[PDB]
Amino acid sequence: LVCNGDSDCDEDSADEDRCEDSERRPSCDIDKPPPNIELTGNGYNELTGQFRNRVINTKSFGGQCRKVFSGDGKDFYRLSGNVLSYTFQVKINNDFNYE
Amino acid sequence: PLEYNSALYSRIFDDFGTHYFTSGSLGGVYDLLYQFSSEELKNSGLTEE
Amino acid sequence: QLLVVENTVEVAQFINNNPEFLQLAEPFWKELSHLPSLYDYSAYRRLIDQ
Amino acid sequence: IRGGRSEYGAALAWEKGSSGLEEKTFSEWLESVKENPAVIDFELAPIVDLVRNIPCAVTKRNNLRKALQEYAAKFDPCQCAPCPNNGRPTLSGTECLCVCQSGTYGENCEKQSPDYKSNAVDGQWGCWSSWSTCDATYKRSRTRECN
Amino acid sequence: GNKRRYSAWAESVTNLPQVIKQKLTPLYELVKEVPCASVKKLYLKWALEEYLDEFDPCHCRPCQNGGLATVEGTHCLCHCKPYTFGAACEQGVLVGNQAGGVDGGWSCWSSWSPCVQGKKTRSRECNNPPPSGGGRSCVGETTESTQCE
Amino acid sequence: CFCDHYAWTQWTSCSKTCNSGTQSRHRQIVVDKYYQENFCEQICSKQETRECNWQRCPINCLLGDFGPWSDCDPCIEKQSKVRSVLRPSQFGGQPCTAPLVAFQPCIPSKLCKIEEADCKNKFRCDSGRCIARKLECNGENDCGDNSDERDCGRTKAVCTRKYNPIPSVQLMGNGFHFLAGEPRGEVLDNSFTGGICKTVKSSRTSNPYRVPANLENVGFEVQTA
Numbered sequence: 001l002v003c004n005g006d007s008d009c010d011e012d013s014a015d016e017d018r019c020e021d022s023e024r025r026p027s028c029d030i031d032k033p034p035p036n037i038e039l040t041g042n043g044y045n046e047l048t049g050q051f052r053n054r055v056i057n058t059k060s061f062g063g064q065c066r067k068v069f070s071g072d073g074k075d076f077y078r079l080s081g082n083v084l085s086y087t088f089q090v091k092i093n094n095d096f097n098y099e
Numbered sequence: 100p101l102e103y104n105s106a107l108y109s110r111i112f113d114d115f116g117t118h119y120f121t122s123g124s125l126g127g128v129y130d131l132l133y134q135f136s137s138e139e140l141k142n143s144g145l146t147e148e
Numbered sequence: 149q150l151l152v153v154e155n156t157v158e159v160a161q162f163i164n165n166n167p168e169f170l171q172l173a174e175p176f177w178k179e180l181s182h183l184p185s186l187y188d189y190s191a192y193r194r195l196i197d198q
Numbered sequence: 199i200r201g202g203r204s205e206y207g208a209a210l211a212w213e214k215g216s217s218g219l220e221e222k223t224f225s226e227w228l229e230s231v232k233e234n235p236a237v238i239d240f241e242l243a244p245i246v247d248l249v250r251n252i253p254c255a256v257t258k259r260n261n262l263r264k265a266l267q268e269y270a271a272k273f274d275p276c277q278c279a280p281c282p283n284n285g286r287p288t289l290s291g292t293e294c295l296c297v298c299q300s301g302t303y304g305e306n307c308e309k310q311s312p313d314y315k316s317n318a319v320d321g322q323w324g325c326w327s328s329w330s331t332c333d334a335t336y337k338r339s340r341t342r343e344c345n
Numbered sequence: 346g347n348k349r350r351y352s353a354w355a356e357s358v359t360n361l362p363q364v365i366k367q368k369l370t371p372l373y374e375l376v377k378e379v380p381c382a383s384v385k386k387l388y389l390k391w392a393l394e395e396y397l398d399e400f401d402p403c404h405c406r407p408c409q410n411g412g413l414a415t416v417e418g419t420h421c422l423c424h425c426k427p428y429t430f431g432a433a434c435e436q437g438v439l440v441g442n443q444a445g446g447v448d449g450g451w452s453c454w455s456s457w458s459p460c461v462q463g464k465k466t467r468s469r470e471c472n473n474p475p476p477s478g479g480g481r482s483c484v485g486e487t488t489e490s491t492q493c494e
Numbered sequence: 495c496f497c498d499h500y501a502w503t504q505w506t507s508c509s510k511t512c513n514s515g516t517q518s519r520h521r522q523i524v525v526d527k528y529y530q531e532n533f534c535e536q537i538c539s540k541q542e543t544r545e546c547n548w549q550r551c552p553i554n555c556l557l558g559d560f561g562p563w564s565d566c567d568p569c570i571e572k573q574s575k576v577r578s579v580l581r582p583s584q585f586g587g588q589p590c591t592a593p594l595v596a597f598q599p600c601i602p603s604k605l606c607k608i609e610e611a612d613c614k615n616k617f618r619c620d621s622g623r624c625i626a627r628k629l630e631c632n633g634e635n636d637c638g639d640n641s642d643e644r645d646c647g648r649t650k651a652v653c654t655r656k657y658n659p660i661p662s663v664q665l666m667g668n669g670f671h672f673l674a675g676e677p678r679g680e681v682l683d684n685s686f687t688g689g690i691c692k693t694v695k696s697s698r699t700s701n702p703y704r705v706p707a708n709l710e711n712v713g714f715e716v717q718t719a
């Protein structure tokens with residue numbers, strides 16, 4: 001993963017330090033993660049019901065160019081290498097009750 | 100693992116489930132229930148004595 | 149009296165990998181690293197707090 | 199609403215329904231469904247058929263067949279209590295969830311729309327009894343009453 | 346809310362969606378890649394159980410009018426249901442339909458028996474409050490047993 | 495009649511906690527010249543009864559105790575242990591909060607016998623996926639690594655346009671948990687093209703979609719099913 005052109009060292013991007021303009025590949029044509037995939041990596045506190053802080057690195061691309069086309073947003077997004085699936089089919093679920 | 104270990108396989112079906120689609124149809128479901136209930140009473144009374 | 153109870157979901161799901169293949173966030177892994185390796189509940193509670 | 203795109207689908211679902219189908223809205227929605235379909239129906243085939251081009255593929259394939267047997271046995275929704283209003287029980291991990299027939303709603307289909315007059319109870323399968331001891335032809339067999 | 350604005354919002358939520366539904370795995374399962382990870386994983390599991398003990402709403406004596414008591418640090422707030430208020434939610438009136446009575450709430454689990462014969466056992470009483478006036482029983486088992494750690 | 499002249503009782507406590515009980519309230523009718531004259535016998539509801547606690551009665555989870563530990567797995571070094579649900583939770587009963595499977599580090603008694611892919615002529619991606627040599631220097635990315643492409647100073651003819659993928663084509667490749675009726679992880683790479691652009695029009699006005707290799711046929715009929 002060193003000099004992928006991708007930051008695979010989560011915080012420090014040290015794998016991309018001081019590495020040649022020749023070595024860094026066009027590893028993928030797009031880097032835009034799905035619009036809030038960071039939220040899928042938060043911890044959760046089950047008693048308070050609150051979402052807590054970032055626990056999983058949900059933008060570890062693993063050197064793959066795992067494009068997905070969202071038909072909803074109509075845009076190409078790059079999934080992380082780990083995520084088992086990420087999909088965009090909408091469900092809309094409306095209760096009105098007037099009395 | 101190469102040797103059978105029920106747990107580590109079961110993980111497979113946890114993560115990916117048991118089957119894949121050989122064929123199917125995609126589209127959308129529109130499912131609506133609307134239910135209106137209404138009830139009026141009127142009363143009018145006049146006496147002259 | 150109105151009630152409106154209403155959801156739009158449009159990321160039908162995400163499924164995170166199992167703990168083996170998940171990549172930990174750097175600060176979370178740093179906090180795990182500094183856990184005392186002994187039942188000092190103060191530290192683990194500060195972890196569950198964050 | 200399942201499938202389509204959030205704006206038009208929202209539009210539709212937010213339709214009160216007092217006059218039924220908003221034809222315009224619906225149309226829009228259906229074009230969005232052409233843009234972003236949802237899975238309506240399918241024919242399943244077992245995932246172990248895919249374990250095909252890996253090291254030890256045949257070993258892991260047969261292991262995963264065995265596995266899927268056991269797993270079915272352990273987590274088949276047959277062991278759920280029956281859902282009301284002939285909904286289908288399903289067993290996600292260790293919780294049974296009910297999938298509701300159209301015209302039944304609530305979290306477990308407990309209450310039904312005015313049109314769901316039908317009181318017929320559909321006979322979901324019981325769990326497979328254990329395999330019998332090998333018969334006079336060395337076949338074992340097992341049965342599920344459907345009760 | 347008028348049609349147009351709900352339209353537009355339901356569009357925008359495509360771009361800033363929030364986690365509205367989730368299935369959860371205990372955080373100790375992630376204890377990994379660290380010195381003593383195997384041990385820290387057990388101590389974290391024990392910390393999860395200690396924390397769920399410390400913040401168990403069992404500690405909170407009941408709120409009237411079905412107010413959910415929650416432990417907030419050392420003290421319990423009552424989250425009164427709509428248009429009910431006060432320290433206990435003793436005041437105002439519930440809107441909408443209620444089945445009535447007082448629903449039963451679990452006492453805190455008694456301390457683990459020390460895995461005698463390798464089985465720990467512990468009990469709770471559902472006295473906090475006792476279900477009254479036709480309110481529904483507390484939901485859950487009275488006792489748990491576990492293998493010794 | 496103006497029936498609100500006779501206010502209802504409060505609702506009777508629900509007849510049952512958990513299985514669709516009935517609660518009722520009745521008007522506090524007092525017979526009076528008003529009641530006698532204003533047709534209040536004919537056209538007032540004298541009592542009202544409704545559903546309550548229609549939510550099905552909760553069933554709590556029961557877990558069995560763990561079996562013995564596994565034999566130590568030579569390549570995983572982490573013997574497993576398992577237990578069974580004696581009944582699932584449902585109707586909102588107490589969940590199976592404890593873990594259903596446990597793992598413990600172990601020292602194997604035996605060695606691994608697994609082998610490298612070693613897939614002869616076929617191009618071993620860095621992932622170790624083996625792809626048809628045809629696809630090496632495809633001008634695409636069939637490994638995802640681009641390892642097929644890294645050193646390719648010349649590439650085969652890419653199709654003349656970046657065709658859109660089929661709508662939601664990846665849904666067709668997610669695994670399906672038949673016992674749970676729910677989609678699971680991505681199982682087929684419907685992104686993989688196999689170095690060809692089979693292409694289908696939903697309509698002649700549309701830009702054609704690129705049919706991925708894993709799909710043998712795709713139809714775009716609209717049906718009111």
Ligand SMILES: *[C@@H]1O[C@H](CO)[C@@H](O[C@@H]2O[C@H](CO)[C@@H](O)[C@H](O)[C@@H]2O)[C@H](O)[C@H]1NC(C)=O
Pocket residue numbers: 122123712713714715
């Ligand atoms: C996908 O949709 C296609 C177009 O509607 C289907 O093909 C049609 O099938 C009907 C019935 O056999 C024919 O009358 C028609 O000429 C056309 O071939 C196709 O079957 C369908 N796919 C599946 C798997 O059903």
